[PDB]
Amino acid sequence: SQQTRVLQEKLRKLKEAMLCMVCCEEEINSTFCPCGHTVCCESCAAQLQSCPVCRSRVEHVQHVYLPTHTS
Amino acid sequence: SQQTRVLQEKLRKLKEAMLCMVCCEEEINSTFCPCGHTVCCESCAAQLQSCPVCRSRVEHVQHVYLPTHTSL
Numbered sequence A: 001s002q003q004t005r006v007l008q009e010k011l012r013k014l015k016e017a018m019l020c021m022v023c024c025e026e027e028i029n030s031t032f033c034p035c036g037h038t039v040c041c042e043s044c045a046a047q048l049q050s051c052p053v054c055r056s057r058v059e060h061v062q063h064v065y066l067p068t069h070t071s
Numbered sequence B: 001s002q003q004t005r006v007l008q009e010k011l012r013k014l015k016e017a018m019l020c021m022v023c024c025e026e027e028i029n030s031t032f033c034p035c036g037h038t039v040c041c042e043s044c045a046a047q048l049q050s051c052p053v054c055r056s057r058v059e060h061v062q063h064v065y066l067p068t069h070t071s072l
């Protein structure tokens, strides 16, 4: 029904929000510290000097293990 | 249809996987460091000296800003 289409859209959007903001292909699994923005996969987070969301200096990257991980 | 019910269940399970594993009420927004398990809200994470997934000592809690976050 149309309701099934609405739910498919909600699911799609939530899944897309879990993907890296740079490559759009791999799941987010890295946090820029100390700001806390958690928006990249490990590869894309590796060479950024400053956060791509807030411009704060990246002192280090913390790997995150999330219950939503499926890749 | 039956597919509407299947999709409602998938959405519910994905939303539940984003909620704190301890209180089941608030969104996950905290990482236990250094182990990296990110399974709690800030209130539960502040009260645990050991990670509830791996039992490693919590040196400190890092707040995480995730694109999936929602609020009232």
Ligand SMILES: Cc1cc(CN(C)C(=O)NC2CC2)no1
Residues within 6 Å of the ligand: A051, A052, A053, A054, A055
């Ligand atoms: C990258 C990137 C884009 C942005 C946009 N934004 C939030 C601002 O410019 N904020 C103003 C206070 C300075 N911030 O970092």
Ligand SMILES: [Zn+2]
Residues within 6 Å of the ligand: A020, A021, A022, A023, A024, A025, A026, A040, A041, A042, A043, A044, A045
């Ligand atoms: Zn990436």
Ligand SMILES: [Zn+2]
Residues within 6 Å of the ligand: A032, A035, A036, A037, A051, A052, A053, A054, A055, A056
């Ligand atoms: Zn930031």
Ligand SMILES: [Zn+2]
Residues within 6 Å of the ligand: B020, B021, B022, B023, B024, B025, B026, B040, B041, B042, B043, B044, B045
């Ligand atoms: Zn909690």
Ligand SMILES: [Zn+2]
Residues within 6 Å of the ligand: B032, B035, B036, B037, B051, B052, B053, B054, B055, B056
């Ligand atoms: Zn742990």
